[PDB]
Design a protein around this nucleic acid. Sequence first.
RNA 1: UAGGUAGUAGGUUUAUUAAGAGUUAAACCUAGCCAACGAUCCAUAAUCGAUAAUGAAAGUUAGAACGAUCACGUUGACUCUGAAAUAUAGUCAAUAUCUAUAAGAUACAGCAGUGAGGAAUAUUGGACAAUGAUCGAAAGAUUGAUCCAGUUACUUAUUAGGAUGAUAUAUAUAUAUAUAUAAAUUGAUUAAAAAUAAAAUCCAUAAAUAAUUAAAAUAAUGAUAUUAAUUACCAUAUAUUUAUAUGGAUAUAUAUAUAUUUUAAUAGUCCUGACUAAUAUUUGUGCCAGCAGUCGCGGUAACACAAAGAGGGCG
Lengths: 99, 97, 116, 117, 305, 62, 287
Amino acid sequence: TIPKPSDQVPDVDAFLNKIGRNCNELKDTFENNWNNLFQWDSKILKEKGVNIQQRKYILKQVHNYRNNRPIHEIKLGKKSFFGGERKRKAFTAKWKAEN
Amino acid sequence: RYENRTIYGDIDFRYHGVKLHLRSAKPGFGLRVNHVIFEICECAGIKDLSGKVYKSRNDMNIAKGTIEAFTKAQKTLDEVALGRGKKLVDVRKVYYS
Amino acid sequence: TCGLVRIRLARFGRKNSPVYNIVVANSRKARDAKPIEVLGTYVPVPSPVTKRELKRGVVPIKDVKLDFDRTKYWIGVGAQPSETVTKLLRKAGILNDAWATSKNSRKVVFERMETL
Amino acid sequence: GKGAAKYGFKSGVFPTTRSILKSPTTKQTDIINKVKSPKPKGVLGIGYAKGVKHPKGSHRLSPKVNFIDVDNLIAKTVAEPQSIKSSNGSAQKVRLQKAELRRKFLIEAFRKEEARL
Amino acid sequence: FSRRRIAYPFYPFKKLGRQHPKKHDTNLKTAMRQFLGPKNYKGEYVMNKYFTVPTNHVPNYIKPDLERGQSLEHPVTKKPLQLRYDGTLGPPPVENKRLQNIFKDRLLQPFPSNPHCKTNYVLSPQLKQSIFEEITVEGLSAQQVSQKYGLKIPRVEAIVKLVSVENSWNRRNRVSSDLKTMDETLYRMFPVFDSDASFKRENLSEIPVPQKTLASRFLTIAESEPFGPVDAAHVLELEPAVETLRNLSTNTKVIYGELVEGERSQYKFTNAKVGKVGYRYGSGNRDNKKDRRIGFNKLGQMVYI
Amino acid sequence: VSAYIPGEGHDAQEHSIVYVRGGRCQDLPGVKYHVIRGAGDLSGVVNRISSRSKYGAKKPSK
Amino acid sequence: PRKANLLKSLARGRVRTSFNKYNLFNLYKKGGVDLKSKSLYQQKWTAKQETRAYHGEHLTEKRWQTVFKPKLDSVAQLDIKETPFLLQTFAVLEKRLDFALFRAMFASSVRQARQFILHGNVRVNGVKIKHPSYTLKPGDMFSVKPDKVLEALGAKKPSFQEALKIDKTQIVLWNKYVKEAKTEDPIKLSELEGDEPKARKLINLPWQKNYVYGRQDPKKPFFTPWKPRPFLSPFAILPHHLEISFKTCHAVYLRDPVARPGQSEVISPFDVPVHERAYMYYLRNGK
RNA sequence: UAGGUAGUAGGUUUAUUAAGAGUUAAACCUAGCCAACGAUCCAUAAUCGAUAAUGAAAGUUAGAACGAUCACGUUGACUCUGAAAUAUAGUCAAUAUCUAUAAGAUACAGCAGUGAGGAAUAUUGGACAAUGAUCGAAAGAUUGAUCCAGUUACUUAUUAGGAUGAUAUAUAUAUAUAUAUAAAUUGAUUAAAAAUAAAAUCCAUAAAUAAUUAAAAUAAUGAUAUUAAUUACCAUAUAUUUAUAUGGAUAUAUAUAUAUUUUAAUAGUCCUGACUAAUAUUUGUGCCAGCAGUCGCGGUAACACAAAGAGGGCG
Ligand SMILES: [Mg+2]
Ligand SMILES: [Mg+2]
Ligand SMILES: [Mg+2]
Ligand SMILES: [Mg+2]
Ligand SMILES: [Mg+2]
Ligand SMILES: [Mg+2]
Ligand SMILES: [Mg+2]
Ligand SMILES: [Mg+2]
Ligand SMILES: [Mg+2]
Ligand SMILES: [Mg+2]
Ligand SMILES: [Mg+2]
Ligand SMILES: [Mg+2]
Ligand SMILES: [Mg+2]
Ligand SMILES: [Mg+2]
Ligand SMILES: [Mg+2]
Ligand SMILES: [Mg+2]
Ligand SMILES: [Mg+2]
Ligand SMILES: [Mg+2]
Ligand SMILES: [Mg+2]
Ligand SMILES: [Mg+2]
Ligand SMILES: [Mg+2]
Ligand SMILES: [Mg+2]
Ligand SMILES: [Mg+2]
Ligand SMILES: [Mg+2]
Ligand SMILES: [Mg+2]
Ligand SMILES: [Mg+2]
Ligand SMILES: [Mg+2]
Ligand SMILES: [Mg+2]
Ligand SMILES: [Mg+2]
Ligand SMILES: [Mg+2]
């Protein structure tokens, strides 16, 4: 079932921008067709030639949009500036020595 | 021979060197014995037999010992019954298998 | 999920062909290690229907042999079920709508019933 | 595989089935009677003989068997709410329902166990 | 003492003597040719007894011991022939008394070397139909039918099953002409089951033999003390043989899950006692052993159990 | 170890890499080993037609 | 499975499960299996050779050993002749789908039956099977596609040229006969290369109206008006443990073959001593 | 390894502990305790099963894999927090590498992987889709647990083609068709075979090529994945999987008459004197070359060495 485009994100491109995680640079693989994006599934996306992680994310955000849950770029997890829990002790010491 | 296929009891007989041991067998269980014993059984009409030779396994003495055991070590049930003055039934036969 | 005692699925069987073993286990002990009590089994691959059967309109079944009374007892003493296990229990009819999360939350075709 | 014939040709093991009531109940009268009967002496005796002493620090007898009053146990583990009608909000209602369900199940389980034994 | 023994016929045949260098023929091949007789332009070995199919309800099984390897009969008259000094065939000088005087049992004995293997009889279609009617319309029990006719109860059930299938095929118009002809030929080949002939009737008191009976026991009862079948059964710790024969002749909480419009499958929850339900821990992996268990699916797919 | 070398002819120096297996040369006393012949500096026995795997011999390949 | 190679040679008089002409001859000229002037081991070997050639030549030895059951089966009549217990050594193979199909005579051979079921023609209780190691339970139907059954039991469908050549000779014979009748319809094969309808139009004998000798329905996989196989009689041994109906080509597997006081239901071309020797061998794996 | 033992054996008390106890610490007594049915001492070894192997069984063997228990996370000691730690933590020392040179950091027995050792044991893979685990109110974040694929015949299993098949021409409502010319491989000249083996012939099926649609998972999410499976030009519409009728797909003759993708087959390796299954024979070598589990074989007639032929196992 197709949903309506909202005021905040009325376009496919706008939706892509909203969701993020480098979902931009994906306006060529499918053109700005609202119905097209929503009806399309995983296999179709794979055939077109998108990534696995990107494919997973888009579908999830589509689903959220359908259910009217707030879509936004929940960024992927990042290691600490110093290091991963294991490497910190040494890295931190090195950083201190440098500075 | 019991039921025209095996020996009556589990016999244990010594002929010179060879120590024989011949167990009776349920029907269908074949001849499972020393090759000389098997040969003798085939000729003597024993279908079912288990057994094992200890001490000497001198082929000739096996052949002599096993026929001696058959003739001598065996007692038919009827003979035993007559000696003791008792009935000596075979339960399987009575049942009808 | 939370807890020390937890009702969850331990994996069994071979590659590309899982069967599950519904257990109650310690949270710390491993996924396929020996648990406190095995309550039941669960094969996720549904029983395959015939073409004629499909045409008629008969749904596949997922078999879930399960000690009901034991499971109930374990729930009572406060052994939290996993996301899949709790769903299974709800489907059976042990647990209420209370356990259903916001994601789960559609007209019903066939209603539940006990049979023999 | 050889030793599985002891256990009915069952390869692999289950964990031991865990007793729901972990002591004998008060309703199990025969057990209580057995416990309380005069303990024997002589060759097949249990305790200490009347005349003979026992080590200074140690107890003479064995400790007494705590018989479960099942109703009491139920009351303690699974108390019904005193504030009966205080209930607003959806999450709170859900929690209350869950509690009720847990009460039901544990009550049933214990009572069944008592009857079953 | 065993050699490698080339399997020449036990019976006598015209061996090779000398022959033209190029032909390269073997004695076995020669013997085979002789057995066959001469081959047609079509391909048929007509003179061989065993080429054509019998239309007699009398199976034409092999008697190499009786005819002494001489298989060749004249097709029209079924009269025996031999290979003479010339290449032409002709009748034998001495007649065979072995082929003339043959028993009932040996006519239904496909292989000469195994007396025990015999052919089972074929049921006439009319008889099968009558059996089917009895079981369905008249509503008689299968045991009574078996007693009447002389078939075994599983055999009767099988027949019934086949009759209904045949009827369904006839309704659909699947039973082709070629199939019918084949069926007729097969019927003609085999001997017919007679319900009156006592020797042809199947023995209906055959129980299967258990383990406890086979292991022989003996009892020294008093000379006068009686000891019947029941007593023997009691000793062995079984039910009596008659009772077992009679037996041969003659719950659990299940929930189903709710089915919402979208979801594609139900959840059937059967009850099961704890300590008896699960997949056991530390069981024997049998996959790399040659005693590995291979089952089959509902769709006939081969599946590792 | 005193190792036997089978085959009609052989290729073994005073330093060659050689693999030893646990056979026994029965006529020679005090030698309870065989050099396995396909592997190492010990080469496969030449123009071997029968029993080729028992020596090093590869399949001639027409 | 073990590859088919020299199964029907004459220098080894091995009697295979088939209706082949060479197999028939082997069966004919074997007589017994000679166990005289042999050691016990040699006798056991010769039994193994003969008995396994018939019973599961496609099976590998190790595989066979694994499947081989010691505990044989039998039935007490409780109402005389001696039951042949040890004919049951290869009773376990009749439980197989492939063997059952062969017994039913829905295949010429065991190999052929195996091929048929691989190709997905057999059914057992509706569901199609592609697995010869499938084992029937008592009560299971099994059903081969009728065309394949006909092919198995029918004659070999001739090539067109061969059929035409056969027709030509028949025509000549007919012409000779009519000449002889007078005293007291030709075809040129070189011209008529591969025009089947033309050939049909040309031909008109009393015993075949148009169709060439071997091709009345070329689209069908067997001989013309269906006739039986060239040596079908000596192998048509109707089994006890199957109930068969040749119209539909269905067959109920009603029993696991079992030995009575009179006979065994394991159809074999070997005497009981041979089967005993085989059993002896396979108990110990030839120890 | 024949004597061992001096907190040793036992009693009385105090501390420490949640709590017993020469367990530690302290104090005072008694003279014990263990041992040739093996003490003390040394050496070796992680232990075990409803696991695996083998046996008729009692047993014996393994302890890879599945699971349960222990101990360790380069070595040794101690401390802190804690219900529980001599913690893969911290402290100090020991060994060996890093820079950043500092009351530094690291220690792959986490996963990949490298060098070494060795007869010998894999990818510096993909995904969090499933099942778990940690954090978070949730949104969802992490996850070399895990699930998947990769390499490796290490193991097991299923397939890895069936039926017919001994010649080639030429001539002339029946039917044993019959003559004639030609040819015919390695052996061998008859019980010496190789050989129904080939080649042909009939019939499929895999793979391919197209179309379709699961299931592992549902609220949605599928790494595996050119997924398994099914159909053979697709769909609907009747009956009981088969059969027929429609709708459209298609192409030549002159909208409707016959058709409907394609299509195979390929095994080693050991052995043939007896134990031990292998009789069709022949050549070379000449106590040499070589064989050999065992007895043995080779000195011109070698069934044993090296080969051809034929044969027997397992595959
Ligand atoms: Mg939480
Ligand atoms: Mg021999
Ligand atoms: Mg050799
Ligand atoms: Mg070779
Ligand atoms: Mg103290
Ligand atoms: Mg101490
Ligand atoms: Mg002190
Ligand atoms: Mg000692
Ligand atoms: Mg160690
Ligand atoms: Mg260790
Ligand atoms: Mg042990
Ligand atoms: Mg282990
Ligand atoms: Mg050990
Ligand atoms: Mg390991
Ligand atoms: Mg540690
Ligand atoms: Mg340490
Ligand atoms: Mg590593
Ligand atoms: Mg390390
Ligand atoms: Mg190395
Ligand atoms: Mg996950
Ligand atoms: Mg990863
Ligand atoms: Mg390995
Ligand atoms: Mg294999
Ligand atoms: Mg020649
Ligand atoms: Mg295919
Ligand atoms: Mg000697
Ligand atoms: Mg020579
Ligand atoms: Mg040899
Ligand atoms: Mg040799
Ligand atoms: Mg050769």
